[PDB]
Design brief:
This is part of a larger assembly, with 8 protein chains of 8 kinds. Chain C has 127 residues and is an alpha+beta fold. Chain C has 4 helices and 5 strands, in the order ββββααβαα. The longest helix of chain E is centred in the middle third of the chain and has 16 residues. By secondary structure, chain H is of the alpha/beta class. A 4-stranded mixed sheet of chain H has the order 1-2-3-4. A 4-stranded antiparallel sheet of chain H has the order 6-5-8-7, covered by helices on one side. The longest helix of chain H has 18 residues. The chains are: A mainly alpha (60), B mainly alpha (118), C alpha+beta (127), D alpha+beta (80), E mainly alpha (155), F alpha+beta (98), G mainly alpha (24), H alpha/beta (206). Strand 1 of chain A pairs antiparallel with strand 3 of chain F. The structure holds potassium ion, magnesium ion (26 copies) and zinc ion (ZN). One magnesium ion binds next to loops of chain C. The site of one magnesium ion has 2 residues of chain D, from loops. Chain C binds one RNA strand of 240 nucleotides through strand 2, strand 5 and helix 3. Chain F: One of its GO terms (biological process) is translation. Chain F: Part of the 30S ribosomal subunit. Forms a tight complex with proteins S3 and S14. Also contacts protein S9. Chain F: Belongs to the universal ribosomal protein uS10 family.
Chain lengths: 60, 118, 127, 80, 155, 98, 24, 206
RNA sequence: CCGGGCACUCUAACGGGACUGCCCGCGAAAGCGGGAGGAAGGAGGGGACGACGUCUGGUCAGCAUGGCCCUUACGGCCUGGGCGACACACGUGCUACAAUGCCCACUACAAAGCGAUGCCACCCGGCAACGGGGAGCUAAUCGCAAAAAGGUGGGCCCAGUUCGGAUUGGGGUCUGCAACCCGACCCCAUGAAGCCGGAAUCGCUAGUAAUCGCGGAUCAGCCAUGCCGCGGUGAAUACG
C-alpha cells in the first residue's frame, strides 16, 4: 500500500478500465470486497470488532 | 466410390464415409448429403451410380479440397514465415502459435521430450 | 374416507392421500408408472401396503416435490406408512419391525474448506 | 482465427504522420511506440521504427504485410 | 477398526427376488453410483439366464456364488525379517465378498458385447463350474495349501 | 390494502416492531392479517484467516436480511392515528406502498 | 468428452451456447 | 495461530454490534466508511478522556453517536463548548448534521479497553511490566469481575528477546459462549519497539 | 388461471422433544450389553470452537512499527516491454484412453445464490457467438433457467473409431481507448498423444468414497480445469 498508489481515487483515471478498486482502510489492491470496499484482512478485523452491522460468524 | 479425389470410403454410413475426405468433417458431410438429397443412413455399397455422380459433382467444386487445401495451408504458413511475422517465427522454431505457455506441457508442438542435465 | 400422510426423505416431500378404491395411484396428475418405470426401486414406494397385504383397498393421490426421484420414492413410502397408521393404529405394531415409519435422516453432508467434497482431502506428494 | 471488430482500429498518432509524409514525399525512418496499431495500405513503402521495449527496430513494410500489427514484426524477447 | 468391531452393514432386500445377496451383487456391479443401470444390467442378465436355461436365475446365481467361495486363502506375514505366504481359513463374509468381486471382475473380462450378456454368461459358467472366477478360486486354493509348510504361522 | 415490507438485520427487532404495529392497528383498524415470514436473504463472505498464504482456514462469515409482510387490510382513517409516528426500533427499514 | 467444443457436454462444461447446444 | 477474537465470537449472544443500522448494498460501504472516519476522529481527540466504546446508530440522515467515557467532564469541557466543537467537526466531516451523546462508565476498571489503555500508559512511562500487569489484574478483580486476565507481548522491559508475561487470576472461560467477557486491546509505542496489551474481564454467566 | 380458503407443503420466529428416563442381565459404583417405546437414542449427524506451550515457524509486501539506509534519486509521472521467456525437472488439477460407452431427438425431479449504468422473459435477423427491438423485476410474485447424470426411442457395433479434441489454417462475435506480444467465445477445416499407466505414492469408514451438474465471491472482459458453497444418484470394506 504505497502512498502514490492511493492516487487510485481519481475523478480523471483517463480510462474506465484503468479504474480499479482498493481497500479504503489499509490501501490494499487485491482481495478488495466491493460490498464493503475493504480488503479481506480489514474485513476480518472490523468484523471481529463488531463495527459491521449484521455481520455474524457463519456455521451450518 | 471415388469421390472428390483418389480416396474411396466403403461399407459404412455415407456421412461418416465422407468424414474420410480431407476437406470435410461431419458438418460439411451433413450439408452435402442434405443438399444432395441422400439418406445418410445407407451404406456406401448401397449407393446409386447417380447418387455418387451427384455427390461428386457437388463436393468436387463447392469447397477447396485435399491437394489445394494442403497447398493453401502450407502457403499460409509459408507466407507467415516469409513476412517475418511473429507467428512465422513460432512456426520456424516449432513452438505454440496461439499464445500458450512453453515452460511446461506444450509438448505436442515440440515433439518428444528431449531431457537434459540439471 | 381419506387418510393423510406426509413422509420426508433427503429434502423431498410427498403428500399422500389414501382414499378407498381400486388400487390405482396418481402422482402429480401422472400415473405411478409414467413418473417411475425407469427407476427399479419405484416398487419400494408401495412396500407399506404389501406390509399389511392390502394392495387393493386404497387408491392413492400423491403430490411430490423436492430432491430427486429416489428420495421422492422413499418419501412416498413414509407418507403411505403414516396415512396407513392414521387409518388404524393397530398397524403400527405391524409396521414398526419393518421400520417403514422410521424417518431417514441421512442428508448430504455440508462441504468444508480445505477439502474437495466435505471430506476428500487434497492429494499431496511431499516429494 | 483472429479478428477484432468492424471499424478497424489504428492509432491516430502515426496515421496523420504517414499521410503527411505521403503529402510531400518518402521521408526516412519514423519512430513509433504504438505497436498496437493496424497496418493500412497507405503505409506500404515506408520504414517504421517500432519500439520493441528496448530499442526501435527498422520494420520495413511491404505489400503482403497489410493487416497485421507493428508488434508482430518487432519481437520483444530474446532467446538463444 | 481399532476400538470397535465394525459391525457389518445390513443391505436392503431385492425388489424382485427379495434376496440381500442379489443387492450386494448389484452394488458390486454398480459404477459411479449408477444403481438403476446396475439393476438393468443384472435383471437383463437374469432374463438371459432363462431362455438359455430352464432353471430360475436365482438358483443359478446362488449356485455360482457357492461355487466361487474359497475355503482357504493365503495372507502375507513378516517373520524373522522375511515375508511368507501363510495359508489360513476364510471367514464366510470374506468368502461372499471375494466371490461377488471375482464374479463381476471375471464377467467384465469376457469378450461379450454388452454387460448383461457378460454377467449372464459368467454366472452360467460359474454355476456349471468353470469361468474366470472358478479359475481365481482354484488359484487361491492352490497358493494356499501350496504353502502348507507355513500352517503354524496361522495367528 | 397497504403493502408493508419490513427489512432488517435483527429478527428480534423486526418481530417486536411488527407486533407493535399489529397491536396499534387492531384497536384502530380491522382484523389484521398478521406478518408473513418473507424468507431471509443470506450473503456469505469467505476470507482467509491469516494475512499470508495459509489457504485452508478461511473463517467465513455471513450477513442475513430478514423481511416482514404485515399487509394491513381495510386502511381505515382511524388506524393511522396510533401509527406513522410510534416506533422503538432503529436498525429497521420500512417500505410502504398502496 | 467435456473438452470437445462441438458437443453438448462440451458446451455445458464450458458454460456456453451455440450451434451444438441451442436455447430451444 | 489460535484464539480468535472473543467479541467477534460472541457478536450473536452477550455482545451487540457497535454500529447498528440497516443499509442496502449500494449504500452499505459508504455508511461504513463514514462510521470508520467517525471512530477515527473520535479516538484521536477523546483519548485524554478515556473512551471505551463508540456506538453508532442510523435511521435516516441522523446518527445517534453515543460515546462511553469514564470521565465525561473532559468531553463536556467548560460549560459544554467541547461537545459543541466536536459536533461542529462531526457536521463538517459528514454533512448529515447529527447529534451526539455521552455516557459515563461507572468503575472504569471493569471495561477492558480502559484497563488495557492504563497498562499501555504505564508501559510507556517505563514502569515494571510484571508489576503493572499484576496490579491491573488485582484492581480489576477487587471490584466484582469474576474473572480477569492481562497479557503483554514481546520486548518486555526493553529486552532484546520478545517475551510474554501472563499474570492472570480468576475465571476466563473463553470457550463458553455465554461468558460475557469484555475484551480490550491497547498499544504501547516505545523507543525500542511496540507493545501489545490485551485485557479480558469476565462477568455474568447467563 | 379466477372465485376461494390457511388443512397440508413451504417460509421464519418461539417452543416442545432424549435424560441410560423405563425393562432385563452384569456391576461396589461410574457404566457396559440387549430391549421397549419413539422421528431420533447411549456424542443422533455436521459445524463454529482448537489449552501451558513448541517450531528464534510465516508475513516489516496488507497494516502498524524500533533501528539502519535513499532523497535532483532506492522518491514521482508516462509510453512500451516484462511478470505469459523454454534444452529441461517436480507439485496440484482438468480432459481422456470408451459399449456400465458415445451421439441425436423427446421428456421428468433439486438446493443454495445472484440481479437497475443489472438480470434480461419474448419477438425478429443470424448455422452460431451475437445484434436490433423490447415486457417484467427496488424482486417467495420477474429474470439468470437449461439442472446434468436419469428415463424413452433411434444411430454407432469394438475400429484409434460417430473413442479422445491436443495442434494448426481460415472466417467471425463481444468486452475494452486498445486483444501483436497476451482475452474469452462462435463457425468451417485440421485431427495429435493417449488401448488404464515403471519404481513409487494419495484420498475416503455413509450419504462418506465415486460420479453428475448448479451458483457465488474478485471481475469491463478473462486464460476458473482454481477456490468457496449447493443439491442429484449413491457403493465397497474394517479379521485384527
Ligand atoms: K519466532
Ligand atoms: Mg506504506
Ligand atoms: Mg480492473
Ligand atoms: Mg476429413
Ligand atoms: Mg506464452
Ligand atoms: Mg455431493
Ligand atoms: Mg467487422
Ligand atoms: Mg480375477
Ligand atoms: Mg482448522
Ligand atoms: Mg468427440
Ligand atoms: Mg396454520
Ligand atoms: Mg403442521
Ligand atoms: Mg467446546
Ligand atoms: Mg527465520
Ligand atoms: Mg505470477
Ligand atoms: Mg532453455
Ligand atoms: Mg544452452
Ligand atoms: Mg517443485
Ligand atoms: Mg431463428
Ligand atoms: Mg407466487
Ligand atoms: Mg438405446
Ligand atoms: Mg475421431
Ligand atoms: Mg499411437
Ligand atoms: Mg479399443
Ligand atoms: Mg473418521
Ligand atoms: Mg465472473
Ligand atoms: Mg466456474
Ligand atoms: Zn485492508
Amino acid at each position: 500500500a504505497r502512498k502514490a498508489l492511493i492516487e487510485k481515487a481519481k475523478r480523471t483515471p483517463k480510462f474506465k478500465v484503468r479504474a480499479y478498486t482498493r481497500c479504503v482502510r489499509c490501501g490494499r489492491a487485491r482481495s478488495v470486497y466491493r460490498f464493503f470496499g475493504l480488503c479481506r484482512i480489514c474485513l476480518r478485523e472490523l468484523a471481529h470488532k463488531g463495527q459491521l452491522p449484521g455481520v455474524r460468524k457463519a456455521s451450518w | 466410390a471415388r469421390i472428390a479425389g483418389v480416396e474411396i470410403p466403403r461399407n459404412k454410413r455415407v456421412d461418416v464415409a465422407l468424414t474420410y475426405i480431407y476437406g470435410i468433417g461431419k458438418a460439411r458431410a451433413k450439408e452435402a448429403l442434405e443438399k444432395t438429397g441422400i439418406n445418410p443412413a445407407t451404406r456406401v455399397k448401397d449407393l446409386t451410380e447417380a447418387e455418387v455422380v451427384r455427390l461428386r459433382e457437388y463436393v468436387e467444386n463447392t469447397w477447396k479440397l485435399e491437394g489445394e487445401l494442403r497447398a493453401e495451408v502450407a502457403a499460409n504458413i509459408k507466407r507467415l514465415m516469409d513476412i517475418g511475422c511473429y507467428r512465422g517465427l513460432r512456426h520456424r522454431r516449432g513452438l505454440p502459435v496461439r499464445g500458450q505457455r512453453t515452460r511446461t506441457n506444450a509438448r505436442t508442438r515440440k515433439g518428444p521430450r528431449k531431457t537434459v542435465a540439471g | 374416507e381419506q387418510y393423510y400422510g406426509t413422509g420426508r426423505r433427503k429434502e423431498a416431500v410427498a403428500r399422500v392421500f389414501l382414499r378407498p378404491g381400486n388400487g390405482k395411484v396418481t402422482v402429480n396428475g401422472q400415473d405411478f408408472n409414467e413418473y417411475f418405470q425407469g427407476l427399479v426401486r419405484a416398487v419400494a414406494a408401495l412396500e407399506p401396503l404389501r406390509a399389511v397385504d392390502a394392495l387393493g383397498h386404497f387408491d392413492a393421490y400423491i403430490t411430490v416435490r423436492g430432491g430427486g426421484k429416489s428420495g421422492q420414492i422413499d418419501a412416498i413410502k413414509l407418507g403411505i406408512a403414516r396415512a396407513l397408521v392414521q387409518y388404524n393404529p393397530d398397524y403400527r405394531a405391524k409396521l414398526k419391525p419393518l421400520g417403514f415409519l422410521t424417518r431417514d435422516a441421512r442428508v448430504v453432508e455440508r462441504k468444508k474448506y480445505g477439502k474437495h467434497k466435505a471430506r476428500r482431502a487434497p492429494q499431496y506428494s511431499k516429494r | 482465427p483472429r479478428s477484432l471488430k468492424k471499424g478497424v482500429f489504428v492509432d491516430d498518432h502515426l496515421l496523420e504522420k504517414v499521410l503527411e509524409l505521403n503529402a510531400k514525399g518518402e521521408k526516412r525512418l519514423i519512430k513509433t511506440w504504438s505497436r498496437r496499431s493496424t497496418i493500412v495500405p497507405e503505409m506500404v513503402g515506408h520504414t517504421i521504427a517500432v519500439y520493441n521495449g528496448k530499442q526501435h527496430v527498422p520494420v520495413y513494410i511491404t505489400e503482403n504485410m497489410v493487416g497485421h500489427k507493428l508488434g508482430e514484426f518487432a519481437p520483444t524477447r530474446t532467446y538463444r | 477398526a481399532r476400538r470397535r468391531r465394525a459391525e457389518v452393514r445390513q443391505l436392503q432386500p431385492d425388489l424382485v427376488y427379495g434376496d440381500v445377496l442379489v443387492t450386494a451383487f448389484i452394488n458390486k456391479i454398480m459404477r459411479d453410483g449408477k444403481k438403476n443401470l446396475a439393476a438393468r444390467i443384472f435383471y437383463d442378465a437374469c432374463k438371459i439366464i432363462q431362455e438359455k436355461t430352464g432353471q430360475e436365475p436365482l438358483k443359478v446365481f446362488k449356485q455360482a456364488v457357492e461355487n466361487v467361495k474359497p475355503r482357504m486363502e493365503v495372507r502375507s506375514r513378516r517373520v524373522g525379517g522375511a515375508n511368507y505366504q501363510v495359508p489360513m481359513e476364510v471367514s464366510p463374509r470374506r468368502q461372499q465378498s471375494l466371490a461377488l468381486r471375482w464374479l463381476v471382475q471375471a464377467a467384465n473380462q469376457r469378450p461379450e458385447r454388452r454387460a448383461a450378456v457378460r454377467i449372464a454368461h459368467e454366472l452360467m459358467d460359474a454355476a456349471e463350474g468353470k469361468g474366470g472366477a472358478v479359475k481365481k478360486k482354484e488359484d487361491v486354493e492352490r497358493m494356499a495349501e501350496a504353502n502348507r509348510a507355513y500352517a503354524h504361522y496361522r495367528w | 390494502k397497504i403493502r408493508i415490507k419490513l427489512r432488517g438485520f435483527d429478527h428480534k427487532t423486526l418481530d417486536a416492531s411488527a407486533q407493535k404495529i399489529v397491536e396499534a392497528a387492531r384497536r384502530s383498524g380491522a382484523q389484521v392479517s398478521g406478518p408473513i415470514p418473507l424468507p431471509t436473504r443470506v450473503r456469505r463472505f469467505t476470507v482467509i484467516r491469516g494475512p499470508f498464504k495459509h489457504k485452508d482456514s478461511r473463517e467465513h462469515f455471513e450477513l442475513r436480511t430478514h423481511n416482514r409482510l404485515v399487509d394491513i387490510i381495510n386502511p381505515n382513517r382511524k388506524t393511522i392515528e396510533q401509527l406513522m409516528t410510534l416506533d422503538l426500533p432503529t436498525g429497521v427499514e420500512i417500505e410502504i406502498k398502496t | 468428452g467435456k473438452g470437445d467444443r462441438r458437443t453438448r457436454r462440451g458446451k455445458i462444461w464450458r458454460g456456453t451456447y451455440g450451434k451444438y447446444r441451442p436455447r430451444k | 495461530g489460535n484464539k480468535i477474537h472473543p467479541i467477534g465470537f460472541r457478536l450473536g449472544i452477550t455482545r451487540d454490534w457497535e454500529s447498528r443500522w440497516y443499509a442496502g448494498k449500494k449504500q452499505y460501504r459508504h455508511l461504513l466508511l463514514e462510521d470508520q472516519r467517525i471512530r477515527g476522529l473520535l479516538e484521536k481527540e477523546l483519548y485524554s478522556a478515556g473512551l471505551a466504546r463508540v456506538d453508532i446508530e442510523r435511521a435516516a440522515d441522523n446518527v445517534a453517536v453515543t460515546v462511553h467515557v469514564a470521565k465525561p467532564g473532559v468531553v463536556i469541557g467548560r460549560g459544554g463548548e467541547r461537545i459543541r466543537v466536536l459536533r461542529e467537526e462531526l457536521a463538517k466531516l459528514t454533512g448529515k448534521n447529527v447529534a451526539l451523546n455521552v455516557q459515563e462508565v461507572q468503575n472504569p476498571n471493569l471495561s477492558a479497553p480502559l484497563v488495557a489503555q492504563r497498562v499501555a500508559e504505564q508501559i510507556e512511562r517505563r514502569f515494571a511490566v510484571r508489576r503493572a500487569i499484576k496490579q491491573a489484574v488485582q484492581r480489576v478483580m477487587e471490584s466484582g469481575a469474576k474473572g480477569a486476565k492481562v497479557i503483554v507481548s514481546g520486548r518486555i522491559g526493553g529486552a532484546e528477546q520478545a517475551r510474554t508475561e501472563w499474570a492472570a487470576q480468576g475465571r476466563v472461560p473463553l470457550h463458553t459462549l455465554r461468558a460475557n467477557i469484555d475484551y480490550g486491546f491497547a498499544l504501547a509505542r516505545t523507543t525500542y519497539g511496540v507493545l501489545g496489551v490485551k485485557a479480558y474481564i469476565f462477568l455474568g454467566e447467563v
